[PDB]
Design a protein around this ligand. Structure first.
Ligand SMILES: CCCCCCCCCCCCCC(=O)OC[C@H](COP(=O)(O)OCC(O)COP(=O)(O)OC[C@@H](COC(=O)CCCCCCCCCCCCC)OC(=O)CCCCCCCCCCCCC)OC(=O)CCCCCCCCCCCCC
Ligand SMILES: CCCCCCCCCCCCCC(=O)OC[C@H](COP(=O)(O)OCC(O)COP(=O)(O)OC[C@@H](COC(=O)CCCCCCCCCCCCC)OC(=O)CCCCCCCCCCCCC)OC(=O)CCCCCCCCCCCCC
Ligand code: BCL
Ligand code: BCL
Ligand SMILES: CC[C@H]1c2cc3[nH]c4c(c3C)C(=O)[C@H](C(=O)OC)c4c3nc(cc4[nH]c(cc(n2)[C@@H]1C)c(C(C)=O)c4C)[C@@H](C)[C@@H]3CCC(=O)OC/C=C(\C)CCC[C@H](C)CCC[C@H](C)CCCC(C)C
Ligand SMILES: COC(C)(C)C/C=C/C(C)=C/C=C/C(C=O)=C/C=C/C(C)=C/C=C/C=C(C)/C=C/C=C(\C)CC/C=C(C)/C=C/C=C(\C)C(=O)O
Ligand SMILES: COC(C)(C)C/C=C/C(C)=C/C=C/C(C=O)=C/C=C/C(C)=C/C=C/C=C(C)/C=C/C=C(\C)CC/C=C(C)/C=C/C=C(\C)C(=O)O
Ligand SMILES: COC(C)(C)C/C=C/C(C)=C/C=C/C(C=O)=C/C=C/C(C)=C/C=C/C=C(C)/C=C/C=C(\C)CC/C=C(C)/C=C/C=C(\C)C(=O)O
Ligand SMILES: COC(C)(C)C/C=C/C(C)=C/C=C/C(C=O)=C/C=C/C(C)=C/C=C/C=C(C)/C=C/C=C(\C)CC/C=C(C)/C=C/C=C(\C)C(=O)O
Ligand SMILES: COC(C)(C)C/C=C/C(C)=C/C=C/C(C)=C/C=C/C(C)=C/C=C\C=C(C)\C=C\C=C(C)\C=C\C=C(C)\C=C\CC(C)(C)OC
Ligand code: HEC
Ligand SMILES: [Fe+3]
Lengths: 124, 271, 60, 38, 69, 335, 179, 52, 56, 56, 56, 38, 57
């Protein structure tokens, strides 16, 4: 998803378009709306590409993305041949999850309630 | 030093405060009571800005930044290290901006003029007062104001604009931008129009008021008046500042979500 | 070279152009009410007052 | 403009218009030989 | 003809020439953007090799980086 | 009560409409006779007078209407020809530029060909309008200040063509759309590292605010001396009256320096022109000389320091590395 | 000493105090420029500002009050006269001056339209003209014209300067601090 | 014919030419943007092979 | 009933009438064009049985 | 019939035709935007098969 | 034929024609330059068999 | 400009037009040998 | 042939050419300074064999 050049002068190392920047902007608008936060929760918008100037949550957010790619690819998608047709999409694919599936528009899911600590069968 | 026609205009009277004590000219400047008040606030505010630079890490002009206090101080006067110096400078700026407006009213009164210039200047002062006084009070902390630094206050604008995920979708911001763009276009048209008549094609006589009205009717089918253009310029420039003040005061105190989502009302019309 | 780049060169060219333009406009600003009157005598700031400019009027 | 002047202009205009259409028809014949569109 | 008494030939000619210019430029530009008649790139192909039936609203990928310039 | 602020006109005169100064009418003429608007006379002049039409104006109107038609028809087709959706979604509709992988080559008609055609017609229309403005100015023996002021804005407009061509792709062009061209503005600033640190961008900001300041100051000044006859600026320029003297003296006493009735218009002209000129230069340097304006500002000491908000371990530095964005997936995989 | 004003004290930069009556001698806000003593001309070599009675092609737009025959309330809230004729600008069609006949007639004076305000900002009943710049008594000392049908730029400055100078000199209170 | 006394023929015929030109452009554009009648690409197809 | 032509100018009525009728005709034609059932440019050759129907 | 002396018929007719025409379009467009009365698509359905809004 | 110069000023026609031809020549040259087959500055030395051809 | 003046200008104009088209014909034939577009 | 100065003003012309020449000279010097081969402030002491050359294809 990176579109920002790590140099002062242009080179062939980065040839991202403005359209790809709009794509990243739309994805990050969705990410912000899924947590009820704005850009500054994860960025110093004076330089979107910087991690040192950004709050620590950005790192957390990145891990979320990776976790989703492991939940969608290996657990939710392979469940396709088990659902009835009413549970699939118009292309006949299994339902998949996003950030709002857990967060539901809050900075933490359920405002950071802790429940799994009292259920040892659920944490590996 | 005075202009060749200046002596007969330098008369007493017209002040709002004071008499012959503060009715003199220092060089070309007129010094009133509010001239004295302006110098006090300008000197105090500038010296405290220099002190804020000396407290910071650099003397580089672009990198000097005097920042407002943290939000946890909440409408109090923070420690001077922690943002209290910003609040003191803000008071000096407000006093200097107000004194400048009242000094202008005194000068126009002495010259037998209207009061348009002080009130036109008040549009800029209102926008500044919204940014550092009205909106921070509505949000409950002086820390919502912008820092005092050449490029530091650009970082504040960027981050505040992105607090609503797309500030271009602010309806009042859209109107205020149109006022700014139309004002620049109208100013270019007005400046060209006067210069083209006064400095016409070489060897031809200076044009008249008919020439302006005929020219803009030939180009556009309508010609605003000689007084109409000056009324319009005042409306466009001042209305740009008034709509700017509205656009920032509704972000946070009234609307807290993203600005694109505000357009639900248009999409959910019953028709 | 390395530190010097195109944006900096263009910025300084613009600065020189702007300063020249400001000098020209300040010269134009002194076409009325000059030279200044002072007890010490005539006074002109920088830039100096330009030559007298005459207009052209239509015949009667 | 007199009626005679309109008559003289009309003759040149009609000949020029029809001749232009014929030249365009030949161009469409050459294009059809190269890559027909129906 | 009496039409030139109602309409000044000077005024009609400019509008007529401008309309023809825009129409000719539109058609030449439309053919240039089509697959079958992009003659600058594929003009040397025979009629059999020319593309057919290539409406394809997503004929090309929309999202990609710039070419390596 | 309050004095007359010269903000509106209560008593309006009516005479025969001004036909206009005699001009050459060989390649054009004036249309209409001149009507009067009661509502317009309250603010300015009431005459909705005749308009001149010639070669350049007619050609400009034809080309511009062609561009407008192309943009509108593509917008309408994008909602499936629904008129209700066309009006309802009009701010969000766009005529989008070609895809990035085509570079400068001709795109397909439905994937950017219409965009390039509409842009070409709009450019031709703008140039023809510039020619018309020049001819209108020189038909009345006026100076050509408005043509060059217009040329400055045309220069800024044409940087939106030249920068995408210099970087090598029509995909980088501005889409035709109300909200979409704002989307492009935001994404263009983001892609090239915070355009706030473009020095010519800051210069154009300064000239835009200076234009607003100058017009507010001049309008207030002229309205304040309009009871002395200051709105007749040509007379006060060729024969300086007490209104011009009082304006000069007000600004000299307030600021320590002043302009004349003529040179304040030079100030206005140059501020308005320099806005778009510096903006065009700044756009031209972006993506061709500088690819990240924040990093250029750090290089030249423009960026103020802040305390670090995060720190990363070495394994975090390797992991938090990402990938540059690439192509969209053209397949729907089955897992 | 040809400007009829004396410095307050011997310190430079000090303001001048007028010696006589500044309204007539033209000092401070009552000062006028020495413009040309010739009438302004339109594009066709005709007088720019003329009374309506010299050009019957001009009229008043519908829905606009006819100010002729209306009382002129001065700064004293006392009628100073009645409007009897309008002076219009032919270059750009607009009312420029009002001609006022005094209460005891025997003379006619001019009144620039820039100092004329209408009641309720011209929204409700427009039955009089408001002149906040001058008193009813000083209407008699307004400078006159050489001719009854044209006005030169020199006198045009004089009438406008006289009215504008009365925002500081109409009464002693207008030239004093408020606190 | 008496309609030509009520309406100016010059303005009527200018508005008629302008209206028909826009209508012709709009219809040709709609067909070009469709699948069945994109004749620049589909023109050589027979009626049976045309999209439905 | 012919007296309405003295109350209203016939020339202005005809222009307003034609303008309203032209706009209305375009809106109806395009409302049908955008619908699934009455596209008629893509699906005009379908029979009434094969034409789409909105969901119950 | 004395209302026409107090109110000018010319402007009353214009305001009546203007209001009724706008009101008719608003009602027609509101129904077209709904699910039960989207008659362009589902006009061939019977009253039993027409959609009904959410219930309690 | 020569009477066209009485109806149209040769000074205006010649200036307009030169402006039209200059723009047309620049547009065609630029379109060829931006293409693959006729980008003569880079690939002008290729033979006719080596020049790019659009896909079949 | 008289009718005789229009005749004299027209002779130079057609010759300049013809000379322009002929030279363009040579340029197009030169380009065809180098890289034919059909 | 000196009658060309009777058709163009010598004072205006020579000021224009001095300005145009100066702008051209500055443009050429600054283009060379920005290049790799002719950045003479840094690499002017390199011999012609050691000077950078653009990529060969
Ligand atoms: C871009 C290109 C162009 C860029 C440039 C654009 C320029 C635009 C403006 C153009 C005009 C500029 C020239 C000008 O203003 O000249 C005034 C004066 C001549 O004045 P004058 O005509 O002789 O004065 C007339 C009249 O006032 C006579 O009155 P009197 O002679 O009695 O003066 C009494 C005054 C002065 O007495 C003072 O004590 C004031 C001293 C002020 C300067 C020193 C400040 C620091 C010490 C402060 C006092 C300490 C105790 C004594 O007394 C007054 O009260 C006068 C009014 C003063 C202000 C109001 C009161 C304020 C009170 C509160 C604040 C107090 C201070 C914090 O001439 C000069 O000063 C000559 C030099 C002019 C060039 C500027 C040189 C600057 C050098 C330092 C540069 C520093 C750069 C960072
Ligand atoms: C990319 C596209 C963008 C966007 C597009 C940009 C396009 C270019 C714009 C350039 C600025 C135009 C400003 C303006 O007002 O334009 C309207 C004017 C209308 O003139 P007109 O209608 O022909 O006739 C009117 C004329 O009679 C009166 O004009 P006005 O007075 O309003 O202004 C024109 C002149 C002032 O005229 C005079 O001063 C003449 C007075 C008698 C002679 C003076 C004494 C003798 C001097 C002899 C030595 C001097 C001989 C010259 O004003 C100007 O031209 C603007 C001056 C201010 C700007 C320059 C300031 C200095 C800048 C350099 C600083 C360097 C560092 C210190 O049109 C003109 O063309 C004016 C004449 C321009 C002369 C300079 C041309 C420079 C071309 C440079 C590129 C050439 C190809 C390489
Ligand atoms: C997130 C968004 C980015 C950003 C991205 C950009 C980009 C990208 C650009 C600007 C540009 C500008 N920005 Mg910025 N900008 C931001 C923040 C700001 C802020 C602020 C409050 O912080 C301000 C005050 C500004 C202000 C400005 C202006 C000074 C400047 C445009 C000048 C102008 O007149 O344009 C308006 C004038 C024109 C477009 C001129 C041309 C007009 C033509 C001729 C009109 C033809 C009309 C035609 C006939 C009619 C329509 C036809 C139909 C289309 C068919 N920006 C942030 C940092 N900004 C521009 C610039 O110059 O940057 C250097 C620019 O391109
Ligand atoms: C990689 C590039 C090379 C180099 C290659 C060249 C080449 C090649 C040439 C120059 C030229 C010049 N270079 Mg270099 N130059 C280099 C580095 C420098 C450095 C430096 C800081 O290192 C400087 C200060 C200069 C300076 C100069 C000027 C002396 C001169 C351009 C004059 C001018 O403005 O004409 C434009 C001016 C005008 C249009 C108006 C003013 C005209 C007056 C008369 C100029 C006087 C200069 C000189 C005395 C000319 C003789 C005049 C007659 C005696 C009347 N070069 C590097 C090492 N330079 C040019 C030149 O003319 O050299 C003589 C030239 O041909
Ligand atoms: C100094 C810089 C500023 C500037 C200056 C400037 N602009 C100028 C000028 C100047 C000095 C002119 O002389 C020129 C002019 O004539 O102004 C009146 C112009 C102008 N600036 C314009 C716009 C403009 N300027 C802008 C900005 C600016 N202009 C800068 C801020 C912007 C912005 C902010 O984006 C815009 C949009 C135009 C009004 C005009 C140039 C007109 C032109 O080129 O027109 C070409 C013609 C067409 C495109 C044809 C259009 C056809 C219609 C769209 C179809 C009509 C269909 C139907 C009949 C009606 C439909 C109604 C709907 C369309 C509402
Ligand atoms: C998506 O696909 C899309 C693109 C949408 C599909 C498209 C669809 C559409 C809508 C197409 C429209 C086509 C159309 C519209 O009607 C086409 C109409 C074309 C027309 C009418 C062409 C007419 C041309 C006329 C010409 C060249 C005349 C020249 C005359 C000459 C040279 C003589 C003048 C010289 C004289 C007189 C000198 C004597 C003077 C004398 C003696 C004197 O002066 O005295
Ligand atoms: C959720 O849904 C939402 C939408 C929100 C819910 C909605 C709610 C609301 C508020 C509904 C309101 C409804 C309403 C309000 O009252 C509705 C009111 C309706 C009314 C009053 C209709 C009246 C119509 C009458 C007409 C058309 C008459 C025409 C007459 C003609 C043509 C004859 C004239 C010709 C003449 C005279 C010629 C003789 C001339 C002569 C002799 C001469 O020339 O002299
Ligand atoms: C969350 O907020 C929400 C949910 C909204 C809750 C809030 C609700 C609120 C605040 C409600 C307020 C309601 C209200 C307030 O009181 C409502 C007040 C209503 C009233 C007073 C209605 C009055 C109607 C009067 C009519 C129809 C009169 C008709 C007269 C006719 C026909 C005769 C015409 C005669 C003519 C023309 C000339 C004849 C003479 C002739 C010819 C002659 O003289 O010759
Ligand atoms: C890439 O795909 C896209 C681009 C989209 C594809 C589209 C392509 C299209 C649509 C192309 C259109 C082409 C076109 C349109 O018709 C082309 C039309 C071309 C024409 C007609 C050219 C004419 C040129 C004429 C010239 C040069 C004449 C010069 C004459 C001279 C010099 C005479 C000098 C002598 C004089 C003055 C006498 C002195 C005066 C005397 C003696 C006096 O006064 O007495
Ligand atoms: C029924 O309604 C119809 C359809 C008939 C008419 C209605 C139309 C409507 C409603 C239209 C609405 C239009 C709108 C809303 C337009 C919005 C426009 C906006 C906001 C535009 C903003 C910015 C656009 C910019 C800056 C575009 C710049 C483009 C440029 C500079 C393009 C240049 C292209 C060139 C020079 C192309 C050359 C072609 C060649 C082949 C030579 O090079 C590629
Ligand atoms: C925390 C949940 C974030 C929110 C809120 C926003 N962003 Fe973000 N951003 C975040 C991550 C984890 C990443 C990297 C994702 C990846 O796959 O690499 C990003 C990245 C960006 C970028 C690209 C940076 C680059 O170097 O190119 C941009 C331009 C960006 N983000 C912008 C952006 C916007 C516009 C946001 C609000 C609408 C926003 N971010 C919020 C984390 C988070
Ligand atoms: Fe002005």
């Amino acid at each position: 998803a990176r579109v920002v050049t790590r140099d002062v002068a242009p080179s062939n190392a980065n040839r991202s378009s403005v359209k790809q920047t709009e794509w990243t902007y739309a994805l990050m608008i969705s990410q912000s709306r899924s947590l009820g936060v704005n850009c500054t929760y994860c960025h110093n918008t004076r330089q979107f590409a910087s991690w040192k100037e950004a709050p620590p949550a950005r790192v957390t957010a990145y891990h979320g993305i990776l976790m989703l790619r492991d939940v969608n690819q290996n657990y939710l998608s392979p469940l396709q041949p088990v659902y009835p047709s009413v549970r699939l999409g118009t292309q006949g694919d299994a339902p998949k999850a996003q950030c709002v599936t857990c967060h539901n528009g809050n900075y933490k899911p359920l405002y950071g309630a802790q429940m799994v600590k009292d259920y040892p069968a659920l944490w590996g | 030093a005075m202009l060749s026609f200046e002596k007969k205009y330098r008369v007493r009277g017209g002040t709002l405060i004071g008499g012959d004590l503060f009715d003199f000219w220092f060089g070309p400047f007129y010094v009133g009571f509010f001239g004295v008040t302006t110098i006090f606030f300008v000197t105090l505010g500038t010296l405290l800005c220099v002190w804020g630079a000396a407290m910071g890490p650099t003397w580089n002009l672009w990198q000097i930044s005097i920042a407002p206090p943290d939000l946890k101080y909440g409408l109090g006067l923070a420690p001077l290290r922690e943002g209290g110096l910003w609040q003191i400078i803000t008071l000096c700026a407000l006093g200097a901006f107000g004194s400048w407006a009242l000094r202008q009213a005194e000068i126009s009164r002495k010259l037998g003029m209207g009061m348009h210039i002080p009130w036109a200047y008040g549009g800029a002062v209102l926008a500044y007062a919204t940014l550092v006084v009205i909106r921070p009070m509505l949000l409950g902390a002086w820390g919502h104001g912008f820092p005092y630094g050449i490029f530091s206050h650009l970082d504040w604008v960027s981050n505040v604009g992105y607090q609503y995920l797309h500030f271009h979708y602010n309806p009042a911001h859209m109107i205020a931008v149109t006022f700014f763009f139309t004002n620049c276009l109208a100013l270019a048209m007005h400046g060209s129009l006067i210069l083209s008549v006064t400095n016409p094609k070489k060897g031809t006589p200076v044009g008249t008021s008919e020439t302006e009205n005929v020219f803009f009717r030939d180009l556009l089918g309508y010609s605003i008046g000689a007084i109409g253009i000056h009324r319009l310029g005042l409306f466009l420039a001042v209305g740009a500042a008034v709509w700017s003040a509205i656009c920032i005061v509704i972000s946070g105190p009234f609307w807290t979500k993203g600005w694109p989502e505000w357009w639900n009302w248009w999409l959910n019309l019953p028709i | 070279m390395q530190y010097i780049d195109g944006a900096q060169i263009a910025l300084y060219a613009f600065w020189l152009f702007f300063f020249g333009l400001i000098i020209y406009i300040r010269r134009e600003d002194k076409r009325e009410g000059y030279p200044l009157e002072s007890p010490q005598g005539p006074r002109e700031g920088w830039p100096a007052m330009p030559e007298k400019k005459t207009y052209i009027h239509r015949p009667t | 403009m007199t009626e005679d002047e309109a008559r003289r202009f009309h003759g040149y205009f009609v000949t020029g218009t029809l001749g232009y259409i014929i030249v365009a028809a030949v161009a469409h014949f050459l294009a059809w030989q190269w890559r027909p569109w129906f | 003809h009496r039409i030139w008494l109602m309409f000044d030939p000077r005024r009609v000619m400019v509008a007529m020439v401008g309309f023809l210019a825009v129409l000719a430029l539109v058609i030449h530009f439309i053919l240039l953007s089509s697959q079958r008649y992009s003659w600058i790139e594929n003009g040397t192909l025979s009629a059999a090799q020319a593309p057919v039936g290539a409406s394809a609203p997503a004929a090309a990928a929309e999202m990609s980086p710039l070419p390596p310039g | 009560m309050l004095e007359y602020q010269n903000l509106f006109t209560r008593v309006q005169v009516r005479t025969v409409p001004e036909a206009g100064i005699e001009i050459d009418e060989s390649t054009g003429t004036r249309y209409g006779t001149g009507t009067f608007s009661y509502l317009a006379g309250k603010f300015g002049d009431a005459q909705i007078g005749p308009i001149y039409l010639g070669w350049a104006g007619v050609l400009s109107l034809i080309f511009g209407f062609m561009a407008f038609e192309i943009i509108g028809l593509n917008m309408w087709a994008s909602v499936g020809w629904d008129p209700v959706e066309f009006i309802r979604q009009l701010p969000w509709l766009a005529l989008e530029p070609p895809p990035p992988q085509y570079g400068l080559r001709v795109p397909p008609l439905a994937q950017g060909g219409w965009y390039l055609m509409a842009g070409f017609f709009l450019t031709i229309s703008i140039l023809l309008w510039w020619v018309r403005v020049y001819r209108r100015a020189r038909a009345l023996n006026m100076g050509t200040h408005l043509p060059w002021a217009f040329a400055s804005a045309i220069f800024l407009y044409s940087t939106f063509f030249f920068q995408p061509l210099l970087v090598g792709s029509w995909s980088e062009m501005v889409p035709f759309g109300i909200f979409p061209h704002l989307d492009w503005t935001s994404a263009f600033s983001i892609r090239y590292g915070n355009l706030y640190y473009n020095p010519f961008h800051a210069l154009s900001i300064a000239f835009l605010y200076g234009s607003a300041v100058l017009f507010a100051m001049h309008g207030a000044t002229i309205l304040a001396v309009a009871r002395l006859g200051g709105e007749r600026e040509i007379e006060q320029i060729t024969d300086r009256g007490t209104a011009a003297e009082r304006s000069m003296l007000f600004w000299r006493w307030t600021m320590g320096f002043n302009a004349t009735m003529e040179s304040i218009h030079r100030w206005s002209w140059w501020f308005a022109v320099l806005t778009t000129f510096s903006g065009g230069i700044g756009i031209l340097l972006t993506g061709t000389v500088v690819d990240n304006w924040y990093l250029w500002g750090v290089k030249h000491g423009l960026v103020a320091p802040y305390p670090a908000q995060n720190t990363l371990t070495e394994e975090q530095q390797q992991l938090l590395r990402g990938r540059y964005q690439g192509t969209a997936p053209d397949s729907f995989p089955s897992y | 000493s040809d400007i009829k004003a004396v410095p307050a004290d011997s310190y430079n930069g000090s303001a001048l105090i007028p010696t006589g009556d500044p309204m007539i001698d033209g000092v401070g806000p009552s000062s006028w420029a020495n413009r040309s003593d010739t009438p302004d001309m339109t594009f066709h070599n005709t007088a720019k500002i003329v009374p309506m009675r010299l050009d019957p092609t001009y009229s008043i737009a519908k829905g606009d009050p006819d100010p002729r025959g209306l009382p002129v309330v001065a700064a004293d809230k006392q009628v100073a006269g009645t409007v009897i004729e309008l002076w219009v600008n032919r270059a750009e069609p607009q009312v420029t001056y009002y001609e006022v006949q005094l209460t005891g007639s025997e003379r006619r004076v001019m009144l620039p339209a820039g100092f004329v305000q209408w009641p309720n900002f011209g929204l409700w009943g427009n039955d009089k003209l408001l002149v906040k710049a001058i008193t009813a008594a000083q209407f008699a000392n307004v400078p006159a014209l050489k001719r009854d049908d044209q006005i030169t730029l020199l006198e045009e400055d004089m009438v406008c300067a006289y009215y504008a100078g009365g925002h500081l000199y109409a009464m002693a209170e207008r030239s004093e601090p408020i606190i």
